[PDB]
Amino acid sequence: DCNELPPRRNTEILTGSWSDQTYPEGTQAIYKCRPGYRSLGNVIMVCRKGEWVALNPLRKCQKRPCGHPGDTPFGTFTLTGGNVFEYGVKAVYTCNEGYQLLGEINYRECDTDGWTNDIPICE
Numbered sequence: 001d002c003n004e005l006p007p008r009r010n011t012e013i014l015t016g017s018w019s020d021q022t023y024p025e026g027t028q029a030i031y032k033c034r035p036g037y038r039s040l041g042n043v044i045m046v047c048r049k050g051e052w053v054a055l056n057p058l059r060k061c062q063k064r065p066c067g068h069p070g071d072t073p074f075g076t077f078t079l080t081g082g083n084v085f086e087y088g089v090k091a092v093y094t095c096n097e098g099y100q101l102l103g104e105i106n107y108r109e110c111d112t113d114g115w116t117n118d119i120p121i122c123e
Contacts, residue, residue: 001025002047011061012043023047033061035112036087063087066110070119074099077108086110095122 002023008014012031029052031043039061046055063086069077074096081089091108095101101120109116 001050002027002052003050004052006045006047006052009043011037025049028055031061036064036110037061038064066114069108069115072119072122075101075120075122081110087112091115093120099123 002025003021005018005021005023006014006029009031011034013034015030015032018029025047028044028046031045033039033042039059041056041059043059043061044055045052047053063082066085066087066089069085069091076094076096077091078094079085079089079091085091087110089110091110093101093106093108099122100106102123103117103120105117106120107117
């Protein structure tokens with residue numbers, strides 16, 4: 001039986017009511033995949049032997065994909081923060097030598113629910 005409360009994590013958050021130091025063994029803790037993160041299901045931990053262990057150790061909340069930021073036949077972009085479209089990358093838009101772009105924001109960033117900006121036009 002638990003003699004400590006379940007922890008809170010970086011990529012995961014406790015979802016449920018926890019208010020006592022001592023919980024019965026076999027109690028699972030359902031974790032939130034933070035806004036901007038996901039897993040597949042939820043990160044389920046469970047109290048076993050007095051400690052909180054991972055019922056599902058395969059589960060953890062990792063970055064969520066953003067999908068396509070919008071491509072263009074003319075122009076390029078580079079990702080900073082990763083090489084994939086995930087929460088945290090900035091798609092720094094680049095262009096051919098002859099152009100720059102329209103807009104003030106020459107990039108797109110991955111926020112919780114997707115990209116912050118649209119497709120900058122090479123001009």
